Subunit: 278 residues, 5 copies
């Protein structure tokens, strides 16, 4: 159904669905143990640095990846399709960053006093709602970065060849789809503006090392998903795709300034309506 017709009316013609996507900062959800690694859930493991200009081998659990979920919608089948009309979305838990009583690098390092330095630095917030996987365009800081072959999907996973210098700019060969949760690094894979005809995405980036994190939250804000012609994302095979990443910055430890990324979960409440298509 490529030709969009009238809205469907009658019993059950509109539905609301909700979901939360937890962040994928590097430590997986398991093991759950708060001694054996689970204490880092919601965070990355300690960022490991390159050893030379030609030896940059980041560990998978130090690389934040995209969150995604595919939600199955009520069975439907001139055919009908589910059309995503609007979304209320919220990043939850910023108040938790008011914990300045922990064991991070303290504000008075001479005397080991003050407060536990709160999360600060680079921030990245993107969400998307669509009727098929988010289309991704690869672009990296360094085409020489030696990403692991297993456990992450990177440009080489797709091309079966090493990255080239064009991958540090826009190389149309380096494309993928966001089809797995916690696998696609956000430092590699960006929303592709040349595709995503059936997805809406919204992103912002704020960089720096000690930048104050900023966040707003309210249950009163609706994001309209209709395009310029009044048509929202159309859900292929009754599948709805949610994608996001919400990085708040890093915490810094008392030992060699080890940094850990902090991510927060995102709530989605999507309103959908049935649409006649041909």
């Amino acid at each position: 159904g490529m030709e969009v017709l009238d809205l469907v009316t009658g019993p059950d013609s509109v539905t609301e669905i909700e979901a939360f996507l937890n962040p994928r900062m590097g430590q997986p959800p398991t093991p759950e143990s708060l001694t054996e690694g689970g204490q880092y859930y919601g965070w990355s493991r300690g960022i490991n640095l390159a050893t030379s200009d030609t030896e940059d081998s980041p560990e998978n659990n130090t690389l934040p990846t995209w969150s995604m979920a595919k939600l199955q919608l009520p069975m439907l089948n001139t055919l009908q399709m589910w059309e995503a009309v609007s979304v209320k979305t919220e990043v939850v838990g910023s108040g938790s960053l008011l914990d300045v009583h922990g064991f991070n690098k303290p504000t008075d390092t001479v005397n080991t006093k003050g407060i536990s330095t709160p999360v600060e630095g680079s921030q990245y917030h993107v969400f998307a709602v669509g009727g098929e996987p988010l289309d991704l365009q690869g672009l990296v800081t360094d085409a020489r970065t030696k990403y692991k072959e297993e456990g992450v999907v990177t440009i080489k996973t797709i091309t079966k060849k090493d990255m080239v210098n064009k991958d540090q700019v826009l190389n149309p060969i380096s494309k993928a789809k966001l089809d797995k949760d916690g696998m696609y690094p956000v430092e590699i894979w960006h929303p592709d503006p040349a595709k995503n005809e059936n997805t809406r995405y919204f992103g912002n980036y704020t960089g720096g090392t000690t930048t104050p994190p900023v966040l707003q939250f309210t249950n009163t804000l609706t994001t309209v998903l209709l395009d310029e012609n009044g048509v929202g994302p159309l859900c292929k095979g009754e599948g709805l795709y949610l994608s996001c990443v919400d990085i708040m910055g890093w915490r810094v430890t008392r030992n060699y300034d080890v940094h850990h990324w902090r991510g927060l979960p995102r709530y989605f409440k999507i309103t959908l309506r049935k649409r006649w298509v041909k």
Copy 2:
């Protein structure tokens, strides 16, 4: 109860109510004595730091908590009526007090112990809500290993009767509560729950950092509309109106080992309500 009909007209069909909620930064309102602890009212007590990666036990009087009040509305009740909250004028009062730079805080010139008394700076957090039932809360913490006190505060373990788990550092749907007591629910634990709160409107913002300048605006000319996309405001169950807030401006820092004290300010609410026919 559930089905929303026409607006009620006639004598006393609209009312305005006002309240102020004082901040709950850690030191309680009593003792009142300015030498026995009352001098910290409006502030937290000095923030105490973890002693290791596995030993983090913050004292309750160092943890800002939610402010809340339940206000009783005029009695009501062929068919039923409910009070509907239409709009609110809200204001955080007292930012001018932060222009006191003549006190005994850590001074700006630490070479000569001179300059000015460093004003309140750092992390800031402002949330308010108005609803017809308690604000629904979702728990989420920095560290599921934090040893919150088991007395005098409501934490995740209070609700679940079990220790926190690693999922409590992200979204764990088991870890939920209702904001039903003033000065009891820490803001570093309990967040507005976007999966509930159908009958409350909430508005929040967070700005982090350690030395960030505090910013605030105030005017008596701004109205916040509380009507939803269908033109319906919060409906007050059992004629109860719930106000919730927290307004953290940052910390002051003392001259002794950089002890930080949170500063909070009071929030004014003036709520306009109308009677609604319901079925």
Copy 3:
């Protein structure tokens, strides 16, 4: 007249009045001599600090206070009242902060070179227009602060009793009216949102120690004073009240980092119309 009726028409039914309010930062307008203290006019005197946690005695001339003026309107008397419809207001003189050639603490303290550090830090801008004095609510940093009994109006002035711990939050007992220029400290007295039914006020605060000052100015911006029912402040006994404070930050001297508050004057042009009342 509590009941508001129709607008009055005919000759001289609309009037426009203008005024400027000079800042009240601590040094009075006199003595005028530029060697006897007049050189500090527009500024506070050097901020003096507490000597202990229990001994905080700020000098009056170090405390910025509210500016205010009561303007008399044309005689009038179903009666008529003057109704304030709108105001054009502007803070004048921000360009003067571009003087970085004076004798302030220099930007290179190592060598005593560079430029004279410009005014920076905490900023506070409030104005109000009303038909009666601005209603004030007291709230202080420290209820133990030992304000002078003479020369400033403080909480103790009103209550005849020492401040209490509730005065560090909202204590409804601690209220006053802005009825005198250069007397009510801005670190004590705030617009009262529980009153001021017949006044409109607009305030903003930006804190910190070295924060860059920011200001906009134009003669093209009108502030509407009408409430949600289309009614502006009604001038009791044909008196119009103007209130403000405009703090730009501090300058810092070359001697023990002594700080002086800087304030700027505010212009008001108020449009008023006659209103029938009963």
Copy 4:
């Protein structure tokens, strides 16, 4: 032309005029030689500081002044007058601040390495369009400042008397008109909000010492000059007055941190229409 009537229609009833105003930061346009001082054109000369609290004698070529031009409109003469309807204005050249390869104070002063520090600090942008000279109100940081008598127009030029302490706040005696380019210091002379009935002005100030400069530029933005009654500035004797100042901050040299103000030129394109007047 006190009473404003209908718009004039017919051939040549609307006109557009354009101009650029170069900045007046302190070094005059001549000498042109890049070894005789011409290399400082667009900049001030090195800011010279006071030698004590009572000895502040800034050199004229260290003080940015207002730019202005009077443009002659087509001859006209119930009479007709030119009415300025709107202006498109832009500050040109912010990209030049991306030169970080010069000999300014370097970013690493420990090793004398890094990049040439770009222009930073206090910024001031004002423009005005009017039918007569911009009305100015004097206000200074320090009434004791010993401005040169020749080569700048200062408060003493107007009053024939030394500045008074009231000149540090609003002194209504201290007024002038912007009638000469490169002569009225911006640290003294501000748009007068109590006059300028026939001019629109728009100003902003951002202070500090190392503040990042910010600028936007586009050819798609129109500033409407009509007042609340739908009347723009009326050009007396067919003269159109343009006034501006656009300070981007300072560069800092490698010798004693000497600062030089940087200004940029401003483009104006003004649309005017003929108006019947009586």
Copy 5:
């Protein structure tokens, strides 16, 4: 040229897309990641003046304008016809792609813990410059420099001297109307020299912003939901002369800083354009 009605019928509206890669200083070739290709997307190390009178920046340290000319379908069989058709640019969706890549703080840049050579690899920070333009002819440029004494290379960059055949004059540090050019070549016009000319560009829309400083956090937004309208105050978009559509941009994110003498390299990001065009009758 007099602008008449919109043309209707099959194929009267079209959308075209393009990406422009940044031109920060290292050219796209050599492609080898050991011979210079590893710097593509970046400048080479910024080299500094050696005195107040000796400022000779290398070409590969100077970011230049990106541009592309797109050729649209021919509309007019006979240009002597009284009424003709032109392509009119109505709107553009534009996006700067790849800000997420700046979240790589695991490389070999100057580290944040300089005592121990630990912490994180300092991310890109500092001065930022974002400009894009869409027009029916080349972007008109106005020259203006920091220093008229700067000794730009004569070969490899188009500078004021390239145009005038004479050394820069002191007026080139402000607005000198003699110092004008057109953006007619990609990767050649330095952005520290050449600015959109507000006195021309009647048939182009440009949008620019500058944020300065040395350690300023970079900020960027991106969405596929934002349309930039290109119609002027009369409802007319850029009209494509000889069916040529010109895209111009620069998108500087700041610098990375190396572990060797704090050497800085500019970082740029590519820009996507999707332009909606419609046929317009003209005479």
